[model samples]
Target: PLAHIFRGTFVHSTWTCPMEVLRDHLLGVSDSGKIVFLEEASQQEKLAKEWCFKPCEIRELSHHEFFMPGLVDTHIHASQYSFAGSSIDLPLLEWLTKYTFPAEHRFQNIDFAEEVYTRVVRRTLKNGTTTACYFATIHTDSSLLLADITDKFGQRAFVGKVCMDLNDTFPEYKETTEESIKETERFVSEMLQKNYSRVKPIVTPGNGVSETLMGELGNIAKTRDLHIQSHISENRDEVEAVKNLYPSYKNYTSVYDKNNLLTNKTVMAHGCYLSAEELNVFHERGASIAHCPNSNLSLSSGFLNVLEVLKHEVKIGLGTDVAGGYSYSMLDAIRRAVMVSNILLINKVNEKSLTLKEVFRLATLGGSQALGLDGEIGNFEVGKEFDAILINPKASDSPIDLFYGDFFGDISEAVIQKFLYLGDDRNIEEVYVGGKQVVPFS
Candidate 1:
């Protein structure tokens, strides 16, 4: 019924614990200190008597390291997984109308939805993303399928049927206000009935379509206390359009604020164009922003002032914004975020801003905090669910002298930098979800 345990001296690419400990590979547990006891040891008292015991069987990994928690991609469109790196030449609104909308329209067919959802979920898990926040297609059945597949694959996800009452060029993608609300209610009710593990529904209005629709959706969100996700000021033209649409409001952020939509639980994606006034409101309301560097760069949305956001003490997280973003790795997103922040910092020349470690925290711990799931999933502790990845530093063929000599003997820091700049899915030795080994490498 049992086998021996494995222990290792974990050497993280970024940070390291003070003591070596037995790693619970099954539960993603990393233990420390000398007096710890293994549950299935040959003789507990003898080991306890000696105050130490050798592993019955040892599995050594020279370059492998363990970290606190698996990453969470807080914003992604599962339907757009297959369409990444395609035509994204146009601006935000035009890109949506020309490419994203048409790709999303395919999900109206149940078969198409099932096919794509399965692939995307598997790929995310393979990529070591234990949890994801997803935007499902507008169709109720399609949305349900997204939830079902996430549950099947044992991935934690927030699945929502996208709602848009206006400005949808495609009739199939558009719904009347009544129909959208009715369908959303049904979607939420269905999700409640399943009560599946790690799968819940969120209320997603497609980019603050109109003030009336936003207010109605916000009321529903407040009533249910559901998690709300929407886009903010991502593009300049879109910001201008939003202003034109809502002339009575002060700016893009005010529209959501006026509608009771800006709550602590709300996640606003792409605050690239947020003004100081908007930042102040976000700080006051405790709302979080999903900063999407790849999307902003691809669509010519201006760079975000992360230093400014941090100064205002705004909650922040990273988003792949796939299709709009070329890559899906959150680590890559973290690296890009660091680079983008530095770009702004250098240009501004007068502000204090992000450090590399802070953004690394954003990709993992900060993301969990933003999603209101800090207690359950963010960091490694005794009672928290174990979600971790094994990264093999020796997996790379690069010379060791480079790390020791030029980098001034900071191996951990060097490894972390190399991982951000050079590492990919290949360097990931294993991925564990909910303390279970799911991704096995060759």
Candidate 2:
């Protein structure tokens, strides 16, 4: 057995614990990439003996450096990276037709796809996103290339070949219903065959997908136990359109439920307009909603009542939402979520706003729960994969300002909070996924 051990500080969240900061700790990661042991530094000799490792194998972390679980982005459009922060004035439907579709349509050129996908992966990695659930365009080949690029970069991901059959605005972007089913099957089979440890395909039916197509996609997901993703209730107009389009169903949630599309493995993004009954349905099906506050605010979409969602006992997570949100960093997602809750509090809709600690958990543990990957990641638990980022608040050219024993001093919650608000990629000294370092790109 290969032994890799680290001694120093680390921070992470458990399911019920908001956050835990462990100092003077020793953690062991096996060559297989799973965390084998997490113990006190005083137990170092015994831990080394138990793992059959010598003292020289223990790696020490500097006083200013602490490991935080790598960020998990529950929803992002890999295809939208090329046009992020452009034409964000319009609402969701108009924005999708005029800007998003045309940009994603450019993926017909494989070289363009390769160039964009490579850059997105590299950027997210540098930003400390070790795992992400990504949406790619309908082109199967280009979608496959996205998965290839994700694997090549050693980032954990669920790459979806987006499916949409009813695109009245962009005729070229919509696939025929039959073609959608066939191509998705092709994409799934090929992706499964790729056998990438940290990469897999998700069944993605766009928000406007027909009931028949959703059923087909749901059948495949059921048969293979594949993860599923899509957009839902991102805007008031979008919700109205879905309700009107599926007149036979009582509510938007019913359409997916009756078609077997809302399962435990399903994650729907931007559910800002979901009703209480709809959230109950989500709870019953064990589905999750990705709360993308930045995109919701950027596109003038309605805000999600996260406090209500939590009271309803539905799972929630944060998402960058890319071009619509105008950022690839989940740190932005966390701050935007706090701001949205603050707005809710200011508007008198919520008595209390969400805290930075809970928002941090939403970005890490909550995101993993949304994507059904909590068992494998999200924290520094033994038997879970070692996905982590080393944060040095005083890194070279770091954005965070530091003072010796000043307002917050070093190696504490205030410093972590400062990093959460002010730090950038420059503060991320290293990133690890599955026990191997990837951010340094070595």
Candidate 3:
């Protein structure tokens, strides 16, 4: 379904090395989600001339403040949606045993799988998350059920079955190394047969605690040339446990590096305990980190040197780390991202570290790149997907006063900042996917 043409001040990032902002009046979006520049409009007069296209119907937005792009979340456990708010007090491995594993064990039930996954997908869409790289529970049936439900709901998703071959105490949740690889092969084949446009399958080895399982899964990933998603250096205990499990490896990252798991398409959840050599390996291999700030704070995981990682040129993005972390909002994720960097810089290095603009880039474009969906989702430029959010400045009390209340100064600057910190689904007036409206508020 094609949408009515829209004219508004739009901002997006360019493909240049470090990424640059481009602002203009965006026009009609194609049915396939590509933005179309209006030929006769002044905003696109130069761009239209460069591309040579004539404009047709045009409907202008009331104000030029809305922003849109295909929202991408690099790391999330879709089955843990039920426990999203309850298990914040536990540590990484303890949290897994107490809440995460127990709750995920219930997902073997198809009905429960449908209920949780549907709710997760709908909630994410309402919150402006268009694309998610999700980790499903170990059940093969439950994992495919999630993929089916994601397609039914018309959201973009990358799902993977949890691959845990050892170190899992629960017999019901564990699998033999061979069984893990075989089931993964079957899951990958099933996704291919579905031929879904947006939903895809990924190879997720649970963690390095199970070295044999991770190695087998890694071999399968390299053999099949599939996208890899998993956890690494999330906490001190997890890092120590991995070192104990793989004594031959140099460090936590080496466990994956030795198994040929490091690559441009690989996205590890957290790198809080990564050593200098490990960070260098990530940089050299072109692997990415899905920095889950809220989860780190909630689980008491150590602060990640995100600024340092970026300094080393290691690709990074944001994650909600649902269940462990609290909210599902990308805006909330961005707020925590900026705050985390500020605190780390101030306390650890005694220096000013990040800017709000950099945080926005991580939430949008940087995330898209981490998920390997950069050009398809992260910007509003022509020929890119037209997924967008319509935000109303008048939604909250004294939006103007609140905007000017920030220390940064001025209402305009405060308005954007306020939206990131204070805004929720209520502030999102509308949401679009592939040029079609998913949630429209009047």
Predicted structure with the largest TM-score when compared to the true one: 2
Runs in model 3 deviating more than 4 A are 1-4, 15-24, 38-56, 91-94, 396-412
| Off by more than 4 A, model 2 | 91-94, 406-412
Better of 2 and 3 by lDDT: 2
79-193 per-residue lDDT for model 1 (tens digits) = 8887777877665667777777888888888899999899888887776677788887778889999999988877777887888877645666677888888888899889879
Ranking of predictions according to lDDT: 2, 3, 1
Please give the range of 10 consecutive residues that has the lowest summed lDDT in model 3. 15-24
In terms of lDDT, model 3 sits at: 0.76
Model 2: colliding residue pairs: none
Candidate 1 residue spans exceeding 4 A from truth = 1-6, 9-63, 91-93, 349-353, 396-409
Q: lDDT per model, in order?
A: 0.72, 0.89, 0.76
Expressed as tens digits, the lDDT of each residue in 86-112 for candidate 3 is 845555667777887788999878999
lDDT of 1: 0.72
Work out the TM-score per prediction: 0.85, 0.97, 0.90
TM-score of 3: 0.90
Residue pairs with backbone atoms closer than 3 Å in model 1 (clashes): none
